From a paper:
The type VI secretion system (T6SS) is a widespread protein export apparatus found in Gram-negative bacteria. T6SSs mediate bacterial antagonism by facilitating the injection of toxic effector proteins into competing bacterial cells in a contact-dependent manner. Here, we present the structures of the T6SS effector RhsA from Pseudomonas protegens and its cognate T6SS spike protein, [name], at 3.3 Å resolution. The rhsA operon contains genes encoding its cognate [name] spike and Eag chaperone proteins, both of which are required for the delivery of this effector into susceptible competitors.
To investigate how RhsA is mounted onto [name] we set out to determine the structure of the secretion competent pre-firing complex (PFC) comprising [name] in complex with full-length RhsA and EagR1. Unfortunately, this conformational heterogeneity prevented us from obtaining a high-resolution 3D reconstruction of the entire complex. Instead, we applied C3 symmetry during processing to determine the three-dimensional structure of P. protegens [name]. In applying this symmetry operator, the RhsA and EagR1 components of the complex, which do not adopt this symmetry, are averaged out during image processing. The cryo-EM map of [name] reached a resolution of 3.3 Å and allowed us to build almost the complete atomic model of the protein comprising residues 8–643. As expected, given its high sequence homology, the structure of [name] from P. protegens is nearly identical (71% sequence identity, 81% sequence similarity) to our previously determined [name] structure from P. aeruginosa (r.m.s.d of 1.035 between 544 pruned Cα atoms; r.m.s.d of 1.428 across the complete structure, S9B and S9C Fig) even though their respective effectors, RhsA and Tse6, bear no sequence or structural similarity to one another beyond their N-terminal prePAAR and PAAR domains. Intriguingly, we identified two spherical densities in the center of the β-sheet prism of the [name] trimer. Based on the exclusive clustering of positively charged residues around this density and its overall size, we hypothesize that it corresponds to either a phosphate or sulfate anion, which probably helps to stabilize the core of [name] given that in the absence of this anion, the presence of positively charged residues in the core of the protein would be energetically unfavorable.
Author numbering:
A (entry chain A), B (entry chain C), C (entry chain B): 5 to 328, 338 to 640
Write the structure that this text describes.
Amino acid sequence: RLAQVNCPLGPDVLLLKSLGGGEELGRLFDYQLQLASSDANIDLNQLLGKPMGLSVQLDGGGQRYFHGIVARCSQNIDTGQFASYEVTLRPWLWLLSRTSDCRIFQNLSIPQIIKQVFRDLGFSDFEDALSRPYREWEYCVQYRETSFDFVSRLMEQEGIYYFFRHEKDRHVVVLADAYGAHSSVPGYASVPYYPRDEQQRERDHMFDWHLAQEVQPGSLELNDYDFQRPSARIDVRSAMPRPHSAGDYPLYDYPGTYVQSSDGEHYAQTRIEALQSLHERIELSGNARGLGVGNLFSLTGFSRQDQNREYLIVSIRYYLVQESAQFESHLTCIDAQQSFRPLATTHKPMVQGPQTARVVGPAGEEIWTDQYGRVKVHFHWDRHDQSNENSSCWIRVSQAWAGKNWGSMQIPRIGQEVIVSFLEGDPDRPIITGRVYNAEQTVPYDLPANATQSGMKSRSSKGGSPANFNEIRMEDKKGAEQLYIHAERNQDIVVEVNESHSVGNNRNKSIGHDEYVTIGNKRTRIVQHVDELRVGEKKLDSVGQSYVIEVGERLRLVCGASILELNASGQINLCGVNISVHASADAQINTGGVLHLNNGGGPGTTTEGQGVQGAISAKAKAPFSAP
Amino acid sequence: RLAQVNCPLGPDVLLLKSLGGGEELGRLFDYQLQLASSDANIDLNQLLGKPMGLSVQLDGGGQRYFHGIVARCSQNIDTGQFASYEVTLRPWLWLLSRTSDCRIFQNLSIPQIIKQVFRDLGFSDFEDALSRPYREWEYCVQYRETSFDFVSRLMEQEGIYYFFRHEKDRHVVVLADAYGAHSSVPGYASVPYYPRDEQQRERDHMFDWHLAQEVQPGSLELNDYDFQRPSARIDVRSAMPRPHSAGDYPLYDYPGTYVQSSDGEHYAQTRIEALQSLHERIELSGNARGLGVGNLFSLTGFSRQDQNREYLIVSIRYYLVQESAQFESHLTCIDAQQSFRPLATTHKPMVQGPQTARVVGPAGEEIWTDQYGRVKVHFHWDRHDQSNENSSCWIRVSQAWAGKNWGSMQIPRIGQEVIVSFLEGDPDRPIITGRVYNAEQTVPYDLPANATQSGMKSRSSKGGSPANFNEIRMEDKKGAEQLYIHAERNQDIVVEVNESHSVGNNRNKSIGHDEYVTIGNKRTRIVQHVDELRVGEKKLDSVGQSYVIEVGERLRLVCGASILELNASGQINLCGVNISVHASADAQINTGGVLHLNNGGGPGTTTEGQGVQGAISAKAKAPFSAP
Amino acid sequence: RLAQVNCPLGPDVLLLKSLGGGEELGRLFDYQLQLASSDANIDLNQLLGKPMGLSVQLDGGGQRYFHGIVARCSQNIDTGQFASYEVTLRPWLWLLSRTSDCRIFQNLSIPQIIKQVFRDLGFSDFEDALSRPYREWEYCVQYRETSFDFVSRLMEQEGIYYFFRHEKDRHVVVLADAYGAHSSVPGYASVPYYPRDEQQRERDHMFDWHLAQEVQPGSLELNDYDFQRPSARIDVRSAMPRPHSAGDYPLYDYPGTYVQSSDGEHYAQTRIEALQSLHERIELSGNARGLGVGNLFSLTGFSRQDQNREYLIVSIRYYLVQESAQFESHLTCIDAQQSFRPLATTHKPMVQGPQTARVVGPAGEEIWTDQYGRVKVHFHWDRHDQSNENSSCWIRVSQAWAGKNWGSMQIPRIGQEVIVSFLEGDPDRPIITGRVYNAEQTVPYDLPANATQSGMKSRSSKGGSPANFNEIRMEDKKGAEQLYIHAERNQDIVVEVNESHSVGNNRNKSIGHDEYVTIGNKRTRIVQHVDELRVGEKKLDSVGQSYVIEVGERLRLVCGASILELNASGQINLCGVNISVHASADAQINTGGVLHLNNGGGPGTTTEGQGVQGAISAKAKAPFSAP
């Protein structure tokens, strides 16, 4: 006879007064029940959220069901036996609009991602009709979004849609991506057309019809960059130009998240097919009780024979009114030979600016990175992942300069905070555009005083203490402008050609051990005034030819009391305490004057206290006394 | 009897034909008057924007008022005595949607911020019922927003709402945040229910009713980062789970502007309570002339005894039609035991990308910064603040590298332009992600020529001239690849272990004064071919043991004419002009040949012009002649 | 008599049943035809997109046309001879909403830009009534936008609008920016008012009227920055305060893309005039068949004599119903003395985050930049431009530090990838906030091993090999902390005052050729233990005064067998193989002991194998043997 409700209160406690609402592929059904019951004092908290459905009799003894979730409950003034309620049914999938989070999914295909969302909320009542092997996303992010909003966006990108199968006590999100996911309802594989201007016909019929068509873009071209293939023409274009005029206007868009071109192809195909799904649609209305969204059904008895086609019900509106039945539906078909595809209804979240984030890596490591300088990151909004190498995509790091091998490298280390930023705000395409200090990652130089101290500083990777650092700090405090270069072990330097140094005043070089200097040709050292050398022991001058000492006033050789002296006045003192000249052959003396011996005119040696080892070692050790 | 208008034209000049519109908590009232007057030639500029109100008689001789601001004026075809006008009333607070600016508010609580907005526009007609001590925001920004849009967002974040008190000639924005701000209207503390199916009842009654309920999220969890507490679990969760099924679906969101966790708690509480305010609401309609938005009123005579409750009028629609009255209202209550809280209706402005901004600080300073390297900033859009240390929050600066103390520091100085950027686009959370040159902050190296000159440069902080700089510029112009390091005073260098230098050709080191070199063990200098030393005065070799000179061909000591010479052929010349050998004890000569004296075979001294002081000082001074 | 369709099927094949729709300045007309034809089997692909129009008879034998583009086609149930169709007409300009791209326009005025968009799509049917000489935008970007959406935004910024001229077979987008672009339709230069309460009047008349007015902001002030004029008060304010109260509330907004202040003036003027266009508008309805959007027409016979004015039809709705006529229009005028100006209806695209982009320049160059360090860029989404110096605005580059001349420079070179970012997301205001490596622009140091290697590296500009680089790499691998400085030619160094070096152990300095050292005063070298010098040839000590050698244990001069020795024990050996002392005057010996000769107590020379040239040259050459 008529419709009866299937509900936890017992089908007899509630009986439908009317029905409203509708359905659409990839969009939540929405059914405004209106019903009456003998109790005005029904606790709506018992109804609300709970599963409720309808039994609608079909001819041939079939039944149709409209199971769903009570998202709104309401009651309205009516006679006491017939207290009126206006429950809205929604799918369990609608409850995913009642929850939000931020969560990262990695190395998962979107069918696997969605089923994680469903299964974590206990929503088991889903089913798979998908036919493509979908891409395994390296990294997906739910961000500032509901679980339904995220879910819908992912399907819309891949061009998945969903439609529902309704049982007595279950309603099932069937995931669908092809004609083959659709089915023809028994006995409604054809629906006749018979107008309301006929006498009221015995079966179910489409009573009204309105074909509609629209100009829709004939092609889409998509590009994305790939830093691993920056030369590669990732550009891919999909085309379904229509026969009609203006059927060829092309669209173009930039970053389809795809990176492999053969994935982007289908992102284009779906984005066009969704608009091609608008190029033709067919309104109908009628009594097709058996038919539902995503069902198929041939048309019969239509006058325009182009319309005697198999149709895909993209959307339905339903009406029932009932006595204690009149059934009506209003619906939009498309030609089943054109694949449906959902629009980008589900507006993506975009991060309208940068993020901060801890850098992370394996528990014992200090840096975790790859051949492009990417890093793993823990976002401060991520609740779910353990702040380790699994907590992000490999994220590229910007560098102050970067070229073909060459350029500046400043690899951010584990625990360092970074300024992330997304390739369009797209949470799925992070990139790092800065590093930043914080009360943990403290500043090198205490800044309210040392604000003038610029320059880099390091800290040895593995277990580096604050004292194990290279540095090139640079203070330009007026009256204290200091360069300070530090190597915590060694400072190699190479120059292919010429060094220079130019120092207005002083230099102190301390070599706490040993210096080698190897000169390939020449040295030339020049002093305006004074040199000193001091040596606590020995000096050797392996001069392979000539050593010429060109003194101007006094050479004074010394060793203790033994003293050779050359005055520029030509007086020589060779005087000592014992002497033993020797020659294997001749020896001589000559004078233009008169050599004589023991004259007593030379009274003594020219000892001046120089060369006394005690002082000389002391003067050579003088820099190296203990602190 | 009926309603009369209160207006500057005189209450008798305008008389109401009808009324429309409604009210809602935290949202502007909106009242479509329709009225008639004997003048069709009313200058609407006189009406428009001006304060106008209604007097509505209440039983017991009371009056109700609907004072407001004429936001729209209109006239429409009618009989001459009854020229018809369709004035819309809006609040004075609505005029804040007619003004926009950008302005920064700092160290102010949102109640103080709003009253600044009101008081600056002269809108004195506001009032305070707030009960919480609100957080003192360190920094708030009106940006790309109206004064109403900004105002509403701030209240919605704190979970403030407002409702109006209407006088004859004033209407007052009452700020409200608790049940206690509401009041019970005299004589309408209860309203009976009596249906239209009763005979027309003598008092004021609710004639219709529709309870409604919705599934709403049972909890919200909020996180924000804090660079001053980056380890701290700022995470805070608020929960109000419902008894019904699906009453526990949790929400999560990231950055609530809060930083202190106990502030974020109430941001969650309000965001849930606003949705809990949707979990139950009660439509009514009836003649409750006395009741208005934010009033309280018990219900009586309802059948379902759960409904005999105190109710909070969250919203009202009003109708009057009049003769020269029929009053109707349609309204939504909530149960007064549940706190109202406004939704996030007021979409926040987000800066969809970075900003430029001058750096600023105290008038005599050059850098103004804190222990984390934050700075004050003058935004180019800020009109109101004097480009000093008060013109911003302490803004963190990104650095090319940053770690635990260690890392690169590049503190931006006063007058320098920076690339700002916001933690989500949120103007209240700026951060700096770059520095940039401009025609004032000119580039170091004139770039159309010197594009190859890389590297840092400095300029002494206090009063540094362009010549007072450290530098490490780095040109890789092919055929001119130059390192250039400069210290405007001193270049300290340390190496914990080993230096190296490796120079393919030349080195020039000039020490314009004095060099000390202190070697803790050994030196070893080696020359393939030639050394020279020149000294304008003195050299000292304090060799504490042995000095051995190992010559291979000719030692030639000299001082003027005095010359000692050692040839490797074993010939020695010790010849001078005067000589005086001396010994305290013996002396000797020996020959295997035959010593004899004045042979005349040695004809002369070996003078070669070496050691003549005039040349030697000159050759040592030769580098140091005047330019 | 009535209306007949002008269509490719022949005006007799289709005849109008009714008409709907309307028009608005700067907005696309939209006309829901309803028509009937003897064929239900009309291929809609023939109708769709094609040009179709109406002929409407005007009195005095005139005709009105409504040519347009069939954007939607539809058919609906009707009698066979009268199969009903519901074609929607849209402008050809509407097809620009059916195409999208990203394209950059440079050094073009917006009138030139738009005509490029039109002319590239073949849409010739546009016309120019513009009166201002518009600014020549340096750089405009279509991004994530349709060609209509982009087009509309550009006109709305300049405050251009458009209206249509309709022919039989053409409809023309007239670009308009002043009253003078409007025209008065013959015979409708005045339209009488005569109410429906009159007997049906013989001519065309406005049958109804509703004046409306609104509070609208009295002024707008605009600012933008200019890095070429960062001191300049680019601030410009436009004002049109109304006489009424609240007629002076000012708006302020930041970045009007203008840079020259006199351009920004008109951006304000238009943004206010558009809102001033809302301050007054006049609804009408009536039979003004001749009048259309953007037409002018005086009013006559109105009672309120303020309304007997010239009016500008800002918008129209049309209705026809027809027999085989009743014409109706509903319209909004403004007073023609107030310039119309379109609202910011067309929401701008904003880049909600950064972009990557290749750097580019002239084909033979390596760097292309200007006196501010700007660069040209090829965006990865740009399809149209050849990746050269024409492919972008001069884009500023952020630098890690930047000041008055001084600061760090890191000029990104041709082929380098950069992180772009926009001044608000505004695609017309790009800026670069980072550089990034990629599989082409490879990282300097192979990072999975060398992650510890920090520091800059270069690569000679013109044809630099990987070996032609300056470097300052900095490894802090624990137990290997290395500084490494490299100049591919020369390393100049200056210090204004003092150097220091402090090396815990070793130093090796190799000078592969020649070292000069020039000391302006003093040197002081001190060795705890040992020095060596080795020289393959010669050493010279031009000591202009005294050389004093202060030995402590043994001076041992040598040249082959010739040996002078000074022991600190006072024993001297002066012994050789031949000797020839000589003096121009006296010579002496003296002893306190007893000189005697050939005693045989000195048995031999003190030869020790030192000074043998073969060894000595070898020991000086020892560092320089072949590898």
